[PDB]
Design a protein around this ligand. Structure first.
Ligand SMILES: c1cnc2cc3c(cc2n1)[C@@H]1CNC[C@H]3C1
Ligand SMILES: c1cnc2cc3c(cc2n1)[C@@H]1CNC[C@H]3C1
Ligand SMILES: c1cnc2cc3c(cc2n1)[C@@H]1CNC[C@H]3C1
Ligand SMILES: c1cnc2cc3c(cc2n1)[C@@H]1CNC[C@H]3C1
Ligand SMILES: c1cnc2cc3c(cc2n1)[C@@H]1CNC[C@H]3C1
Lengths: 206, 205, 206, 206, 207
């Protein structure tokens, strides 16, 4: 309708796009994972394929507006390509990530954004021991590729990976799955980088 | 011709595109499935591959015209990218859905739209017992990814999946195939989301 | 060359693109198949891979010109994106079609266009009996996805499939291959649709 | 720098792109192949995978300039997308060709263009006898997909395929390889088409 | 915010893009490799699959600015598509490289650029002996596709490849990996071309 088209026109045409966070104006992204399925294990290459959602939230003043000035609209859907999004990357991936869902974000009048893409990922993981009762553990680090912790900071809402949607007939059952903020330095660069470490222990279902 | 060229110009360059449904102007999408073939079963990863087509219908006021003002044209075909389409998604997919058909829709003068994409889909399914005679049952949910039931509702015209085009020499025969609207809640959000549950019982032929 | 640049400019830059055929302005589209190779047969999924050319022909008034007014130019080549092309689709495909040739068409001064995309296609076919001498038969139906026979008058030139390019050393030899216009109705719509039925009889070469 | 940006501007922004050759203005394209590696052989489907360079050369008056008018610049590199390039295609491919190199041409002040993409090609080939000492022979025809002998002629600079940088540690070694111009009819068209026939004889290296 | 938006505007939208290096204005690109994983070895086709990232650095006069003129901005992240990048290519690749990371570069006020794409590469390599103690050695050649040494020169900051991030549970363990500038001629062309030669020695992880 008219107001929403007016609102989206204002936010996206009145101004050039948000150029990303800076040291002067850093951003915090809240990251949470929903694990759908461990689809595949490959012991000839030590790769494991994972289907999951990645819940992302951040807030920008450039996406703020007054609902009264727009027929009481307090939020809207929009293509993730219309707006800036964080370069959150899985560091142990072995193939380009595969997108499983539409890429549409919800923007709220207070400038907050929620974006939840579903993905399939192959990543480095030695599955040796997956057929035992103890199972095997693998770890994933999700973080910004190019922004240090002075520009993008990460946090979680919970330490528990959401398993409420996990496929009950998966070849693999999950014994535990956690998500933990952590920080490290890389050789190339002087500043610390922030990541959320996904640690998943699993085994062959029986 | 010039009447159609004028009408399309008067609809797509006339106004900004439809920004999608809202709670004040919700949209009901009608869905129907035609199952072409169960192509492949993988008992090592619990994936099944389906080829099907999905009939989508919906109606937008912004796509309306008086035919009399355009040489009596009552409907036209156009690229799906020229118009807004619903984000209907298979929730259990394990690979990006592969489109097999041109992405073209028909728009009628009353604003109604019909879009029928053919697709190959890999989804989550334990096919254990497909080699028996009782067969195996798998379930598939299709729904808007980002719109709740206050924004997009869904409907089916029939509970029967259309099987009149099913491959007679498929490696798998279909014992039953239903499509049912249902309401679900998800951990991230408090609102109800609507899906259409595709339940397919099948076995080796 | 200046004449051709000027010609393309007048045909494409001036008026908008042809919006496709309609009930008020039906269009004849001619189809012929040149079968190149049956690459692969999979009896675990009943899928067959075929490599072929699809010769497409049609004619538009909006693409006509008088050669006299353009240095006696009688034809040119142009990107398929510059013009309308028919949505011809293989109905029994199981994977997206893989394009093997450049997407370029030839336009002649009388307005006729020829577009010949080479393609690799996987489709449903039960190859039980391919190893015998009576061989196996498979049917494949090509047609517009969205245009009925009120809009597209689909036809072949000949009923014989062009086999003069078929790979002599293929794993599979062709016993017979026909191409025939047929009229079908579909559940969704009341209009009759036109397709070309491709029937191919083939066996393992020996 | 200044003079080069000015030259590229004057070439690409003043007049539009070369629209391709015609009957009355044909273009001769020179072609050489450099074989890098026969990567793979598939005897269940009669497909062979090849990695090669394709050296293309042609000349356009519309790409000529006076170097003295442009700071003694005699040539320059530019994205292949900024200029017209010929639609050379392998007729016997079974999968879309994969590009392995940047796609950048060199344009020289006399209007001559050199373009050398590296590619991987799956094509129709019977490897029956690849493990013998006499090896097996296969052939590949390369030509414009849509320009006939009236619009594009092809020539080779030599009859011999460049094998000087072939990969010494390939599963397959090359006994001989030739490239030869030939003229051919196709069922669709009365105009003959020119191709270059690549004939390669190889065997498994031991 | 506003200054950053204004700065990017002046660099990209006002001046036409850099047309690349020439003999008159040659360019030096510094390259360094960080090897994450040897995923796969195919002895039926002599291909090896490798996951690595590649650190690239160069400097352009045309990317310089005075920070006091732009709210003290000394650097910024920008899409790799917004700027010129070197056409560094693995010569031995057998598949198109698969990009694993966002394609975002960092540009600094002195005109220097840093770009670190992560990639999966399939390349030609005979892995015979990979299941032995002594292992197998393979060589990769990275260089410009179309610029000779008169237009693009290369260097490493060190001769030792970075192995400290190598996945410890790979199927394959690395014995050594070096990265060395080298000069070559090619049949088609009269000018020397520069590359960094990456030599990796590895074997199957056992015991
Ligand atoms: C700027 C541009 N790209 C970078 C890539 C990486 C890093 C910093 C970068 N800074 C370290 C952290 N993230 C991945 C690699 C290495
Ligand atoms: C806004 C944006 N993305 C969403 C993704 C999902 C959901 C709601 C969203 N709302 C729940 C339902 N649909 C899929 C997942 C979870
Ligand atoms: C408009 C848009 N899409 C359609 C898809 C199909 C059909 C008609 C359509 N009309 C029937 C015929 N062609 C393929 C399927 C079903
Ligand atoms: C116009 C457009 N496409 C064509 C494709 C081919 C041919 C002519 C064409 N002319 C014959 C020669 N080139 C490949 C096939 C057949
Ligand atoms: C200009 C344009 N393309 C080239 C391609 C190559 C070469 C030089 C080129 N110069 C030699 C070096 N790079 C790869 C091949 C061969």
């Amino acid at each position: 309708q008219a107001n929403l088209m007016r609102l989206k026109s204002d936010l996206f045409n009145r101004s050039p796009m948000y150029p990303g966070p800076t040291k002067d104006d850093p951003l915090t992204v809240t990251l949470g994972f929903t694990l759908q399925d461990i689809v595949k294990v490959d012991s000839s290459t030590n790769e494991v394929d994972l289907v999951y959602y990645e819940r992302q939230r951040w807030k920008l003043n450039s996406l703020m507006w007054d609902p009264n000035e727009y027929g009481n609209i307090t939020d809207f859907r929009t293509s993730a390509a219309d707006i800036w999004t964080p370069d959150i990357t899985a560091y142990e991936s072995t193939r380009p990530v595969q997108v499983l869902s539409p890429q549409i974000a919800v923007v709220t009048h207070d400038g907050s954004v929620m974006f939840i893409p579903a993905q399939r990922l192959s990543f480095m993981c030695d599955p040796t021991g997956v057929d035992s009762e103890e199972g095997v553990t693998c770890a994933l680090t999700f973080g910004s590729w190019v922004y240090s912790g002075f520009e993008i900071d990460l946090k979680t809402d919970t330490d528990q990976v959401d398993l409420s949607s996990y496929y009950a007939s998966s070849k693999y059952e999950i014994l535990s799955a956690t998500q933990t903020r952590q920080v490290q330095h890389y050789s190339c660069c002087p500043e610390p980088y922030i990541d959320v470490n996904l640690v998943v222990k699993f085994r062959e279902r029986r």
